[PDB]
Amino acid sequence: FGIDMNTDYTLEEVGKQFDVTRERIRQIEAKALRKLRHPSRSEVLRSFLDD
Amino acid sequence: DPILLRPVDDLELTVRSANCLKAEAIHYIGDLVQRTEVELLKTPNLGKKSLTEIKDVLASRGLSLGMRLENWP
DNA sequence: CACCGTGCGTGTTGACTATTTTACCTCTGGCGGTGA
DNA sequence: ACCGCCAGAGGTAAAATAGTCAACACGCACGGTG
């Protein structure tokens, strides 16, 4: 996403540094997202969701 | 209690423990707490580690076993 | 306590579809040459 | 005052790239049995 950095690196370069072939790094990213998604870890981030 | 009627998903349990609960089809924590250690061990594919985790997570929020509820829901 | 039999998380292709840019026609403004 | 000419701005093709959807080894790790 580009948090604390200067570019939204695509999966290719992220795999270069983390050694892989996209699908695994895609795998690592999705777990994190579903994780930060459950309550008990996303109440204040939810507040920031204008409603 | 408001917390009990929340599904087990929010309880933040392991994949194997979640599958064991799904096999037991336990929707609410209020129903789960009524049971006891031996009854939980009666569940297949569940060992001492899973029961220990369940006890620890219940104790983290102050929940335990043995409390009998009535008219729930 | 110790040993062996599955379960399951952890790393790996192949085929398919959805952006994204780039280039090719077409409208439609502006513009300047030329004229007692 | 007019009339032929020029360039900036769109709709549609097409190539390139990125994201999306189901199998095989392999090494811990849990459970049965002694």
Curated annotation (Swiss-Prot), chain B:
Source domain of life is: Bacteria
**Entry PTM:** Acetylated on Lys-48 and Lys-49 in the presence of glucose. PatZ controls acetylation of Lys-49 but not of Lys-48. (Microbial infection) ADP-ribosylated on both alpha subunits by the phage T4 protein ModA. ADP-ribosylated on only one of the alpha subunits by the phage T4 protein Alt.
Modified residues annotated as ADP-ribosylarginine in this record? 16
Which residues get modified to N6-acetyllysine?
A: 48-49
Q: According to the UniProt record, where is the region Alpha C-terminal domain (alpha-CTD)?
A: 1-73
Q: Cite the record's note on assembly.
A: Homodimer. The RNAP catalytic core consists of 2 alpha, 1 beta, 1 beta' and 1 omega subunit. When a sigma factor is associated with the core the holoenzyme is formed, which can initiate transcription. Both the N- and C-terminus interact with different regions of transcriptional regulator CRP. The rRNA transcription and antitermination complex (rrnTAC) consists of RNAP, NusA, NusB, NusE (rpsJ), NusG, SubB, ribosomal protein S4, DNA and precursor rRNA; S4 is more flexible than other subunits.
Question: How are the domains described in the entry?
Answer: The N-terminal domain is essential for RNAP assembly and basal transcription, whereas the C-terminal domain is involved in interaction with transcriptional regulators (such as CRP) and with upstream promoter elements.
Q: What does this protein do?
A: DNA-dependent RNA polymerase (RNAP) catalyzes the transcription of DNA into RNA using the four ribonucleoside triphosphates as substrates. This subunit plays an important role in subunit assembly since its dimerization is the first step in the sequential assembly of subunits to form the holoenzyme. Part of the processive rRNA transcription and antitermination complex (rrnTAC). The complex forms an RNA-chaperone ring around the RNA exit tunnel of RNAP. It supports rapid transcription and antitermination of rRNA operons, cotranscriptional rRNA folding, and annealing of distal rRNA regions to allow correct ribosome biogenesis.
Report the family membership. Belongs to the RNA polymerase alpha chain family.
Task: Please state what the protein is called.
Answer: DNA-directed RNA polymerase subunit alpha
